[PDB]
């Protein structure tokens, strides 16, 4: 355990702080074997370092997405597992709790190591070392194969699952590629197919709530009617309180998610702001303050825009919202920065040189900016002001602003979105799948007032027998697939 | 179109005021129906095929988002247009019309001096204008740019199938 | 004819509900030949199942757009047609 051997940002190289771990990490299979069955002093294969990582954890840590590194890690992992089968068969090395409380599969899911993760998730062996396998085959009548993936510590029924780690703990940039590889796939689709009713029920409840909101905000003063207005206002207050409490509970439960992903949610903060604005307007009404109406109207606008959260239930529109987000984040802000700088620079100039007496336009900094924005929209009044003999200078400034802005920046913006849409048309589907997975994981729990009971996924099936006694049982997830290439070779 | 024409003709005998709207709608639909017969040439049949593909693929998502946004902003501008410090944004029909005018390029983005919510109204108008005219429409242009390039390969086969059906 | 052998939306596998059809669909040319000229009891090549499909119909049903599946189906179809030429030449199996 040294600064060169501890994992940090520097000139270090982490390997596990153990001679066996060092031997395994350096593709040295000759010394690994000799270290385990040397008569004098064998080295325990379940030994741990100060950080808590074991040999398998160390192999996961040094893993990258490079093909050669991935192959090396996979081969060494398989060989070490097979050797551990023949030395310590009463203990499994896969289930070893780290100091932070992780296993090699969970550690790979959290660190972002895609290749070793997909290998461990679906690994198959021959007749020997059959128990040490995840993917199985029940019956292969004809060309159809029935795969039995293991749902150990990957199903959401457990407290700390791999799906939850991927969704709310992984800080890797492209972590959406993990919810579309194997098992995690079909499982999420099957969960979403059963969670459809609750999702659409929540959407309907929100729609009814905002319909009531709009009706109340419309019919308000500058009897039966007053009674209905009061009932609607108290209903809105209760709904705002409910939304505020729900969003507060969500943020308190997932405090270490905002820093990891400050834009992947993008809607919980919007719902929180909308609920806060609604509650603030409702409580401020009692104070009899003039700024009640602006707050209520802003809350109405934000809530009506918040309906685009619920569009992630269809293949067609969820990707559309994903591209909306990508366009907003990639090329909308640079254009806004350049546009604002240019607009301010021209507006100050037109304000300065609009005071020659040979109401007048460009009287203040607010008017000139408005006129330039009108020019941008297509309503700019590009005229020949005859009341001041700086006609030429003003006209030339207006033309110079118009050319570069309306002919260059906006068309280039169109081209930039044309590039961006084509660029992000490939990964949008995976991001939509990740969003649906996050929604499913959130709906798996109940509300802040009622905790739903978990429904365990998969089924308990006959899978081999443990090599020390009566047959063992594990929960699997059946998936059938018709492959002819797979069937044609096994003859 | 045929049903509308027959209905208008038979309704004329009843002497009902709604004769002219039905006749005019039938005329519009029939004049638009001439694009059926454009599938006789290599050049224009593919054009109609791409028209159909663009309409089906990316015109409806944009319409849904646009209608939601327009309604959300129109209700707001209607609600906060009643402060007496004819007036615009009197009803839900007027505000929607003004927002559609903004979309077309004729929106009157002015500084209404007759109510002291000038700042709130102007900020709402600017917020609606930015995201709608600068983001949704340009992204629509980009989306059709992608869709045309994507469907430029199978359009010929679809035109051949249409000709075979004919 | 069973729920696992009838074609529907489930966990089934349709092959024609006939031993000759099953042999043809499973790329087993050794048993198909023996089923046709066995002295004891030959199997008619124009036999039909409950659905009405024949061996060629069954081959068409299991056909996909995959290259290996397409090659298998094409080869088996051609071989079965050529064999049917030499066994029942007074009747065509295409019609």
XYZ file of C-alpha atoms in Angstrom:
752
model
C 0.000 0.000 0.000
C 1.870 3.031 -1.320
C 1.138 6.274 -3.131
C 2.392 4.701 -6.374
C 0.186 1.653 -5.719
C -2.931 3.420 -4.406
C -5.481 4.404 -7.044
C -5.623 8.185 -7.496
C -5.034 10.932 -10.080
C -1.295 10.827 -10.692
C 1.507 8.528 -11.855
C 0.268 5.434 -10.018
C -0.735 1.890 -11.026
C -3.293 0.030 -8.914
C -3.134 -3.768 -9.008
C -4.584 -4.920 -5.658
C -1.657 -4.510 -3.213
C -1.188 -8.282 -3.147
C 1.459 -10.470 -4.828
C -1.236 -12.806 -6.167
C -3.161 -9.801 -7.486
C 0.020 -8.424 -9.064
C 0.710 -11.785 -10.712
C -2.850 -12.012 -12.042
C -2.891 -8.439 -13.363
C 0.387 -8.848 -15.299
C -0.790 -11.799 -17.451
C 1.558 -14.153 -15.589
C -0.284 -17.466 -15.319
C 2.901 -19.414 -14.526
C 3.449 -17.726 -11.154
C -0.252 -17.619 -10.200
C -0.435 -21.414 -10.260
C 2.791 -21.832 -8.286
C 1.563 -19.360 -5.660
C -1.553 -21.443 -4.936
C -0.314 -25.039 -4.573
C 3.239 -24.464 -3.312
C 3.711 -26.944 -0.425
C 5.493 -24.448 1.834
C 3.034 -21.558 2.117
C -0.021 -21.261 -0.155
C -1.542 -17.848 -0.814
C -5.230 -17.523 0.031
C -7.338 -16.687 -3.019
C -9.945 -14.822 -0.923
C -7.382 -12.451 0.602
C -8.161 -8.735 0.675
C -6.169 -5.504 0.631
C -6.569 -2.326 2.706
C -9.131 -0.912 0.267
C -11.112 -4.161 0.582
C -10.733 -5.234 -3.046
C -9.914 -8.868 -3.819
C -8.234 -10.474 -6.827
C -11.447 -10.398 -8.866
C -12.100 -6.816 -7.753
C -8.545 -5.889 -8.753
C -9.074 -7.475 -12.176
C -12.281 -5.460 -12.570
C -10.529 -2.226 -11.567
C -7.750 -2.458 -14.175
C -10.249 -3.404 -16.884
C -10.724 -1.036 -19.817
C -12.795 -1.017 -23.021
C -9.757 -1.876 -25.160
C -10.142 -5.233 -26.959
C -6.788 -6.666 -25.843
C -7.228 -5.500 -22.242
C -10.789 -6.841 -22.190
C -9.641 -10.212 -23.539
C -6.821 -10.392 -20.983
C -9.137 -9.529 -18.086
C -11.819 -11.978 -19.241
C -9.367 -14.852 -19.681
C -7.657 -14.240 -16.337
C -11.017 -13.912 -14.565
C -12.289 -17.195 -16.010
C -9.044 -19.027 -15.231
C -8.959 -17.730 -11.650
C -12.600 -18.698 -11.103
C -11.984 -22.204 -12.452
C -8.923 -22.590 -10.220
C -10.876 -21.353 -7.201
C -13.434 -24.046 -7.971
C -10.788 -26.748 -7.428
C -9.145 -25.236 -4.311
C -11.970 -23.771 -2.161
C -15.268 -25.312 -3.345
C -17.164 -24.539 -0.119
C -17.002 -20.761 -0.712
C -17.847 -18.774 -3.845
C -15.542 -15.898 -4.771
C -18.222 -13.983 -6.696
C -20.039 -13.032 -3.474
C -17.330 -11.091 -1.631
C -18.408 -7.844 0.032
C -16.107 -4.879 -0.564
C -15.548 -2.256 2.124
C -17.926 0.023 0.228
C -20.217 -3.008 -0.123
C -19.879 -4.203 -3.720
C -19.184 -7.417 -5.649
C -17.216 -7.871 -8.916
C -20.428 -7.592 -10.947
C -21.628 -4.535 -9.021
C -18.120 -3.054 -9.074
C -17.985 -3.470 -12.858
C -21.446 -1.916 -13.210
C -20.457 1.085 -11.084
C -16.991 1.706 -12.551
C -18.318 1.596 -16.115
C -16.354 -1.424 -17.392
C -18.728 -2.520 -20.151
C -16.859 -5.543 -21.560
C -16.200 -7.458 -18.339
C -19.741 -6.580 -17.257
C -21.312 -8.131 -20.356
C -19.021 -11.153 -20.057
C -19.871 -11.807 -16.395
C -23.580 -11.164 -16.985
C -23.784 -13.895 -19.673
C -21.048 -16.497 -19.154
C -21.390 -20.178 -20.072
C -19.083 -23.121 -19.367
C -18.858 -26.758 -20.451
C -19.918 -29.843 -18.495
C -17.154 -29.230 -15.987
C -17.537 -26.094 -13.855
C -21.224 -26.110 -14.780
C -22.393 -24.505 -11.482
C -20.084 -21.534 -12.111
C -22.285 -20.220 -14.926
C -24.964 -17.565 -15.398
C -26.561 -18.338 -18.773
C -28.042 -21.816 -19.191
C -30.177 -23.854 -21.604
C -33.309 -25.714 -20.504
C -34.519 -27.414 -23.703
C -33.400 -26.917 -27.313
C -36.133 -28.744 -29.243
C -35.419 -27.958 -32.885
C -33.768 -24.616 -33.686
C -35.219 -22.714 -30.684
C -33.071 -22.063 -27.607
C -34.372 -21.332 -24.105
C -31.775 -19.254 -22.262
C -31.933 -19.119 -18.455
C -30.076 -16.027 -17.280
C -29.311 -15.833 -13.565
C -31.083 -13.017 -11.702
C -28.693 -12.961 -8.741
C -28.163 -9.408 -7.443
C -29.314 -7.934 -10.754
C -33.051 -7.979 -10.043
C -34.592 -4.891 -8.433
C -36.189 -7.041 -5.701
C -32.892 -6.805 -3.782
C -31.961 -3.616 -1.928
C -28.781 -2.888 -3.926
C -29.203 -4.264 -7.440
C -27.084 -3.824 -10.565
C -29.917 -1.938 -12.286
C -30.087 0.613 -9.466
C -26.293 0.997 -9.519
C -26.347 1.652 -13.271
C -29.230 4.109 -12.974
C -28.281 6.174 -9.922
C -24.632 5.480 -9.040
C -22.687 5.101 -12.289
C -21.055 8.379 -13.350
C -19.662 7.068 -16.639
C -20.603 9.299 -19.611
C -22.071 6.587 -21.857
C -23.771 4.526 -19.142
C -26.879 4.111 -21.317
C -25.173 1.308 -23.266
C -25.539 -1.010 -20.251
C -29.361 -1.095 -20.261
C -29.507 -2.452 -23.814
C -26.973 -5.305 -23.859
C -28.423 -8.612 -22.649
C -30.483 -9.642 -19.602
C -31.004 -6.054 -18.337
C -32.842 -5.624 -21.663
C -35.781 -8.082 -21.793
C -36.152 -7.697 -18.022
C -36.725 -3.944 -18.290
C -39.179 -4.407 -21.166
C -41.147 -7.004 -19.183
C -41.217 -4.726 -16.124
C -42.378 -1.747 -18.200
C -45.101 -3.821 -19.883
C -46.530 -4.493 -16.409
C -45.955 -0.934 -15.126
C -47.830 0.678 -18.048
C -51.136 1.039 -16.076
C -49.603 2.909 -13.138
C -47.602 5.192 -15.436
C -50.666 6.183 -17.445
C -52.713 6.535 -14.246
C -50.149 9.021 -12.927
C -50.253 10.852 -16.260
C -54.057 11.051 -16.106
C -53.952 12.318 -12.516
C -51.475 15.051 -13.452
C -53.568 16.007 -16.490
C -56.719 16.292 -14.366
C -54.831 18.346 -11.780
C -53.566 20.840 -14.351
C -56.980 20.992 -16.027
C -58.379 22.059 -12.649
C -55.456 24.491 -12.337
C -56.207 26.093 -15.712
C -59.941 26.351 -15.014
C -59.313 28.013 -11.645
C -56.667 30.396 -13.016
C -59.034 31.415 -15.823
C -62.194 32.075 -13.770
C -60.822 34.396 -11.100
C -61.910 37.886 -10.016
C -59.929 40.961 -11.005
C -72.517 32.359 -4.213
C -72.068 29.011 -5.964
C -69.298 30.370 -8.189
C -67.240 31.648 -5.272
C -67.693 28.303 -3.508
C -66.399 26.448 -6.570
C -63.497 28.903 -6.848
C -62.560 28.327 -3.199
C -62.778 24.547 -3.626
C -60.541 24.740 -6.692
C -58.013 26.967 -4.929
C -57.760 24.673 -1.901
C -57.475 21.680 -4.249
C -54.589 23.420 -6.032
C -52.927 24.172 -2.689
C -53.192 20.510 -1.676
C -51.850 19.344 -5.040
C -48.918 21.737 -4.845
C -48.133 20.545 -1.322
C -48.264 16.931 -2.523
C -45.936 17.609 -5.461
C -43.528 19.590 -3.271
C -43.381 16.794 -0.692
C -42.843 14.158 -3.374
C -40.020 16.080 -5.039
C -38.403 16.840 -1.674
C -38.529 13.147 -0.760
C -37.015 12.213 -4.127
C -34.154 14.691 -3.722
C -33.510 13.661 -0.107
C -33.456 9.964 -1.056
C -31.081 10.485 -4.023
C -28.839 13.295 -2.787
C -25.732 11.796 -4.443
C -27.301 11.797 -7.911
C -27.451 15.489 -8.827
C -23.664 15.878 -8.819
C -23.213 12.597 -10.714
C -25.880 13.542 -13.284
C -26.875 17.226 -13.272
C -28.945 17.013 -16.472
C -30.092 13.394 -16.918
C -33.161 13.984 -14.741
C -33.996 17.495 -16.009
C -37.632 17.188 -14.888
C -37.610 16.518 -11.148
C -36.073 19.956 -10.613
C -38.692 21.418 -12.970
C -41.520 19.724 -11.055
C -40.005 20.972 -7.787
C -39.845 24.537 -9.128
C -43.429 24.351 -10.403
C -44.757 23.035 -7.085
C -42.781 25.641 -5.138
C -44.105 28.439 -7.358
C -47.691 27.211 -6.987
C -47.410 26.978 -3.193
C -45.712 30.384 -3.004
C -48.445 32.025 -5.089
C -51.177 30.387 -3.010
C -49.649 31.507 0.296
C -48.872 34.974 -1.091
C -52.523 35.457 -2.058
C -53.355 35.643 1.661
C -50.830 38.497 2.000
C -52.762 40.414 -0.708
C -49.696 41.178 -2.823
C -49.906 42.424 -6.414
C -47.350 39.820 -7.600
C -49.816 36.936 -7.124
C -50.841 36.822 -10.793
C -47.302 36.711 -12.303
C -46.337 33.821 -10.014
C -49.554 31.925 -10.743
C -49.130 32.449 -14.497
C -45.476 31.374 -14.464
C -46.434 28.265 -12.491
C -49.181 27.507 -15.021
C -46.746 27.870 -17.932
C -44.126 25.665 -16.289
C -46.648 22.989 -15.350
C -48.152 22.904 -18.839
C -44.638 22.533 -20.259
C -44.017 19.762 -17.691
C -46.380 17.436 -19.600
C -43.452 16.523 -21.873
C -42.114 14.320 -19.084
C -44.897 11.802 -19.729
C -44.104 11.505 -23.437
C -41.408 8.906 -22.656
C -43.908 6.057 -22.968
C -43.793 5.662 -26.736
C -41.029 4.694 -29.152
C -41.732 7.651 -31.452
C -41.925 10.710 -29.192
C -39.442 9.829 -26.445
C -36.619 9.874 -28.978
C -38.006 13.211 -30.179
C -37.664 14.652 -26.672
C -34.164 13.166 -26.432
C -33.160 14.995 -29.620
C -34.817 18.130 -28.219
C -32.527 17.882 -25.188
C -29.453 17.159 -27.326
C -30.151 20.133 -29.608
C -30.731 22.434 -26.629
C -27.509 21.337 -24.909
C -25.212 21.109 -27.959
C -26.019 24.071 -30.240
C -28.411 26.542 -28.676
C -26.168 28.179 -26.084
C -23.219 29.191 -28.271
C -25.653 30.840 -30.678
C -27.400 32.591 -27.786
C -24.083 33.892 -26.438
C -22.931 35.247 -29.805
C -26.395 36.654 -30.553
C -26.647 38.444 -27.208
C -23.165 39.938 -27.557
C -23.911 41.135 -31.099
C -27.357 42.472 -30.179
C -26.029 44.413 -27.189
C -23.147 45.817 -29.226
C -25.458 47.067 -31.960
C -28.215 48.236 -29.592
C -25.859 50.435 -27.570
C -24.619 51.986 -30.819
C -28.079 52.716 -32.236
C -29.141 54.173 -28.874
C -26.066 56.416 -28.795
C -26.486 57.811 -32.332
C -30.256 58.431 -32.200
C -30.273 61.912 -30.659
C -29.863 64.338 -33.591
C -32.763 66.793 -33.995
C -32.455 67.835 -37.634
C -41.663 60.030 -30.140
C -38.405 58.841 -31.727
C -37.235 55.226 -32.148
C -34.272 53.760 -30.270
C -34.900 56.028 -27.304
C -33.419 53.657 -24.745
C -31.454 50.431 -24.488
C -34.727 48.496 -24.090
C -36.265 49.795 -27.328
C -33.271 49.135 -29.594
C -32.962 45.547 -28.361
C -36.671 45.082 -29.058
C -36.261 46.422 -32.603
C -33.298 44.126 -33.267
C -35.252 41.135 -31.955
C -38.097 42.165 -34.270
C -35.571 42.169 -37.119
C -34.607 38.629 -36.115
C -38.244 37.474 -36.048
C -39.085 38.949 -39.447
C -40.892 42.137 -38.406
C -37.995 44.619 -38.272
C -38.832 48.081 -39.607
C -35.829 48.859 -41.814
C -36.800 52.363 -42.903
C -35.111 55.632 -43.867
C -35.544 57.924 -40.854
C -35.819 61.444 -42.302
C -35.804 63.303 -38.961
C -32.017 63.094 -38.406
C -29.186 63.665 -40.867
C -27.338 60.512 -39.736
C -29.572 58.564 -42.142
C -26.635 56.886 -43.857
C -24.882 55.803 -40.666
C -28.057 54.375 -39.117
C -29.028 52.575 -42.329
C -25.538 51.104 -42.764
C -25.492 49.929 -39.144
C -28.920 48.333 -39.579
C -27.846 46.590 -42.790
C -24.599 45.371 -41.215
C -26.505 43.947 -38.250
C -29.143 42.371 -40.515
C -26.730 40.665 -42.935
C -24.508 38.865 -40.428
C -27.401 38.019 -38.102
C -30.358 37.005 -40.293
C -28.302 35.675 -43.231
C -25.342 34.076 -41.454
C -26.013 33.137 -37.812
C -29.538 31.749 -38.258
C -28.798 29.739 -41.408
C -25.640 28.397 -39.766
C -27.822 27.457 -36.786
C -30.071 25.501 -39.153
C -26.995 23.743 -40.543
C -25.699 23.053 -37.029
C -28.932 21.355 -35.977
C -28.849 19.466 -39.279
C -25.444 18.089 -38.273
C -26.401 17.473 -34.634
C -29.572 15.513 -35.417
C -27.694 13.223 -37.812
C -24.914 12.797 -35.222
C -27.196 11.920 -32.290
C -29.683 9.856 -34.300
C -27.731 6.724 -33.288
C -27.500 6.952 -29.476
C -30.922 8.529 -28.879
C -32.615 5.121 -28.667
C -30.273 3.954 -25.900
C -30.829 7.194 -23.968
C -34.590 6.689 -24.273
C -34.204 3.125 -22.984
C -32.176 4.438 -20.038
C -34.877 7.025 -19.299
C -37.544 4.313 -19.380
C -35.401 2.155 -17.081
C -35.072 5.026 -14.601
C -38.836 5.589 -14.729
C -39.469 1.871 -14.146
C -37.061 1.815 -11.199
C -38.774 4.845 -9.663
C -42.243 3.330 -10.170
C -41.051 0.080 -8.565
C -41.107 1.926 -5.256
C -44.379 3.419 -4.071
C -45.205 7.006 -3.204
C -43.872 9.003 -0.266
C -47.005 7.982 1.654
C -47.402 4.328 0.541
C -44.526 1.895 -0.040
C -45.472 -0.664 -2.686
C -44.665 -4.340 -2.198
C -41.945 -5.666 -4.491
C -42.810 -8.389 -7.011
C -39.821 -10.664 -7.575
C -38.828 -11.170 -11.212
C -38.052 -14.514 -12.817
C -38.887 -17.921 -11.406
C -37.169 -20.586 -9.320
C -35.989 -23.384 -11.604
C -33.952 -26.590 -11.476
C -30.396 -25.551 -12.381
C -27.808 -28.291 -11.834
C -26.724 -29.445 -8.391
C -24.149 -28.167 -5.921
C -21.045 -30.334 -5.813
C -21.291 -31.078 -2.095
C -24.860 -32.268 -1.572
C -28.498 -32.099 -2.674
C -29.464 -29.971 -5.714
C -29.303 -26.180 -5.427
C -31.917 -23.724 -6.695
C -31.576 -20.204 -8.083
C -33.995 -17.720 -9.633
C -33.676 -17.474 -13.422
C -35.228 -15.416 -16.228
C -36.328 -17.450 -19.243
C -35.860 -16.015 -22.725
C -36.599 -18.011 -25.870
C -34.981 -17.221 -29.210
C -35.157 -18.866 -32.638
C -31.649 -19.031 -34.110
C -30.755 -21.249 -37.057
C -27.028 -20.454 -37.158
C -26.673 -21.518 -33.516
C -28.592 -24.736 -34.190
C -26.833 -25.690 -37.428
C -23.337 -25.941 -35.938
C -24.290 -28.340 -33.114
C -24.835 -31.299 -35.434
C -64.955 14.232 -51.441
C -67.791 12.474 -53.278
C -69.819 12.166 -50.071
C -69.335 15.864 -49.300
C -70.353 16.866 -52.830
C -73.489 14.703 -52.734
C -74.367 15.943 -49.240
C -74.025 19.588 -50.289
C -76.109 19.005 -53.417
C -78.920 17.289 -51.500
C -78.737 19.854 -48.682
C -79.238 22.691 -51.171
C -82.819 21.467 -51.658
C -83.360 21.802 -47.886
C -82.320 25.489 -48.149
C -79.775 25.317 -45.329
C -77.167 28.021 -44.717
C -74.354 25.424 -44.449
C -74.496 24.639 -48.189
C -71.579 26.926 -49.077
C -69.088 25.608 -46.455
C -69.713 22.015 -47.560
C -69.406 22.899 -51.248
C -66.187 24.844 -50.617
C -64.651 22.064 -48.514
C -65.536 19.554 -51.234
C -63.925 21.816 -53.844
C -60.739 22.118 -51.771
C -60.523 18.372 -51.176
C -61.164 17.532 -54.821
C -58.567 20.019 -56.054
C -56.068 18.496 -53.617
C -57.090 15.039 -54.907
C -55.322 15.734 -58.229
C -52.066 14.593 -56.597
C -53.260 11.009 -56.970
C -52.660 11.192 -60.726
C -49.060 12.358 -60.341
C -47.922 8.727 -59.949
C -47.399 8.369 -63.698
C -43.928 9.878 -63.895
C -40.578 8.861 -62.426
C -39.884 12.358 -61.076
C -43.047 13.413 -59.234
C -44.326 10.093 -57.880
C -41.229 9.780 -55.714
C -41.854 13.378 -54.635
C -45.336 12.442 -53.416
C -43.879 9.370 -51.694
C -41.449 11.590 -49.774
C -44.357 13.934 -49.009
C -46.179 11.009 -47.394
C -43.064 9.846 -45.527
C -42.390 13.343 -44.162
C -46.024 13.756 -43.099
C -46.091 10.380 -41.328
C -42.611 10.430 -39.743
C -41.968 13.978 -38.470
C -45.008 16.209 -38.694
C -47.158 14.787 -35.903
C -44.678 14.883 -33.015
C -43.963 18.524 -33.833
C -47.691 19.264 -34.017
C -48.286 17.623 -30.631
C -45.479 19.527 -28.904
C -46.450 22.774 -30.652
C -50.111 22.482 -29.664
C -49.243 21.705 -26.042
C -46.831 24.653 -25.870
C -49.229 27.028 -27.636
C -52.128 26.128 -25.346
C -49.947 26.449 -22.254
C -48.760 29.914 -23.238
C -52.139 31.085 -24.573
C -53.960 30.253 -21.338
C -51.299 32.184 -19.417
C -51.438 35.301 -21.604
C -55.249 35.231 -21.449
C -55.161 34.976 -17.653
C -52.721 37.870 -17.103
C -54.270 40.331 -19.587
C -56.904 41.921 -17.343
C -55.107 44.747 -15.490
C -56.587 48.212 -16.130
C -53.695 50.513 -15.252
C -60.306 46.779 -27.261
C -57.441 44.934 -25.549
C -55.367 42.062 -26.988
C -55.519 38.505 -25.651
C -59.143 38.930 -24.646
C -60.031 35.265 -25.021
C -58.439 31.878 -25.594
C -59.119 32.219 -29.340
C -57.263 35.529 -29.706
C -54.084 34.516 -27.860
C -53.741 31.338 -29.926
C -54.147 33.442 -33.067
C -51.415 35.839 -31.919
C -49.042 32.967 -31.139
C -49.711 31.416 -34.549
C -48.979 34.827 -36.080
C -45.685 34.806 -34.169
C -44.950 31.405 -35.705
C -45.745 32.633 -39.230
C -43.590 35.750 -38.950
C -46.252 38.389 -38.269
C -46.355 38.367 -34.453
C -46.734 41.806 -32.873
C -44.134 41.723 -30.094
C -44.785 45.146 -28.587
C -44.607 46.862 -25.197
C -48.220 47.170 -24.026
C -48.341 50.388 -21.980
C -51.937 49.997 -20.744
C -51.134 47.467 -17.978
C -48.291 47.467 -15.466
C -47.526 43.768 -16.075
C -45.423 44.886 -19.058
C -42.368 42.955 -17.907
C -44.194 39.691 -17.239
C -46.035 39.756 -20.574
C -42.878 40.660 -22.503
C -40.841 37.934 -20.786
C -43.554 35.355 -21.479
C -43.682 36.415 -25.131
C -39.893 36.213 -25.459
C -39.781 32.810 -23.749
C -42.454 31.476 -26.100
C -40.739 33.001 -29.152
C -37.227 31.688 -28.425
C -38.042 28.016 -27.865
C -40.686 27.933 -30.604
C -39.345 29.977 -33.536
C -35.633 29.368 -32.845
C -35.648 25.774 -31.597
C -38.697 23.742 -32.686
C -38.923 25.003 -36.279
C -35.195 24.778 -37.034
C -35.125 21.312 -35.470
C -38.078 20.449 -37.720
C -36.011 21.551 -40.720
C -33.166 19.330 -39.512
C -35.564 16.428 -38.937
C -36.891 16.586 -42.495
C -33.286 16.885 -43.676
C -32.568 13.566 -41.951
C -35.824 11.913 -43.049
C -35.432 12.756 -46.744
C -31.897 11.339 -46.804
C -33.113 8.234 -44.931
C -36.079 7.495 -47.217
C -34.359 8.483 -50.465
C -33.464 4.798 -50.982
C -36.802 2.963 -50.628
C -38.998 5.643 -52.223
C -38.469 4.203 -55.712
C -39.706 0.761 -54.651
C -42.763 2.301 -52.972
C -43.514 4.216 -56.176
C -43.202 0.982 -58.167
C -45.610 -0.710 -55.746
C -48.071 2.175 -56.139
C -47.854 1.889 -59.926
C -48.381 -1.877 -59.660
C -51.498 -1.347 -57.538
C -52.798 1.198 -60.054
C -51.179 -31.459 -33.839
C -50.544 -29.831 -30.467
C -50.393 -26.364 -28.951
C -46.582 -26.539 -29.033
C -46.736 -27.666 -32.678
C -49.530 -25.379 -33.912
C -48.404 -22.006 -35.249
C -49.448 -19.171 -32.925
C -48.017 -16.400 -30.725
C -46.248 -18.265 -27.940
C -43.489 -20.806 -27.288
C -44.349 -23.082 -30.213
C -42.485 -24.404 -33.272
C -44.461 -25.248 -36.410
C -42.929 -27.837 -38.737
C -45.892 -29.431 -40.560
C -47.242 -31.987 -38.038
C -45.761 -34.810 -40.109
C -42.639 -36.937 -39.508
C -41.473 -36.341 -43.086
C -42.044 -32.607 -42.632
C -40.156 -32.695 -39.325
C -37.259 -34.529 -40.977
C -37.153 -32.040 -43.856
C -37.328 -28.978 -41.596
C -34.441 -30.142 -39.369
C -31.850 -30.412 -42.188
C -31.858 -34.211 -41.894
C -31.462 -35.533 -45.435
C -30.418 -39.007 -44.248
C -33.808 -39.827 -42.714
C -35.864 -38.149 -45.467
C -34.471 -40.561 -48.054
C -35.010 -43.609 -45.840
C -38.605 -42.546 -45.165
C -39.467 -42.552 -48.884
C -38.062 -45.832 -50.250
C -38.238 -48.049 -47.152
C -39.694 -51.383 -48.366
C -42.017 -51.810 -45.377
C -44.114 -48.636 -45.393
C -43.217 -45.619 -47.556
C -44.385 -42.159 -46.525
C -46.422 -40.290 -49.129
C -44.741 -37.063 -50.227
C -48.092 -35.378 -51.001
C -49.478 -35.966 -47.501
C -51.159 -33.076 -45.702
C -51.674 -32.004 -42.098
C -54.785 -30.662 -40.339
C -53.995 -27.092 -41.406
C -53.707 -28.314 -45.013
C -50.023 -27.475 -45.444
C -47.747 -29.992 -47.165
C -43.993 -30.541 -46.939
C -43.268 -27.698 -49.364
C -45.769 -25.475 -47.547
C -44.100 -26.356 -44.239
C -40.698 -25.453 -45.693
C -42.121 -22.116 -46.850
C -43.627 -21.418 -43.418
C -40.377 -21.856 -41.464
C -38.463 -19.771 -44.007
C -36.927 -16.487 -42.868
C -34.800 -13.753 -44.465
C -31.643 -14.986 -42.713
C -28.959 -16.142 -45.185
C -28.334 -19.524 -43.534
C -32.047 -20.252 -43.090
C -32.737 -19.183 -46.677
C -29.950 -21.428 -47.983
C -31.214 -24.373 -45.922
C -34.801 -23.911 -47.113
C -33.748 -23.488 -50.751
C -31.522 -26.572 -50.731
C -34.120 -28.750 -49.002
C -36.861 -27.514 -51.346
C -34.797 -28.297 -54.446
C -33.765 -31.720 -53.139
C -37.340 -32.646 -52.209
C -38.626 -31.524 -55.612
C -35.959 -33.560 -57.411
C -36.787 -36.620 -55.301
C -40.503 -36.171 -55.973
C -39.657 -36.169 -59.670
C -38.289 -39.724 -59.384
C -41.043 -41.151 -57.127
C -44.361 -39.638 -58.326
C -43.815 -38.248 -61.851
C -47.522 -38.243 -62.777
C -48.344 -35.511 -60.224
C -46.612 -32.180 -59.615
C -46.126 -31.091 -56.006
C -46.008 -27.369 -56.837
C -49.752 -27.286 -57.588
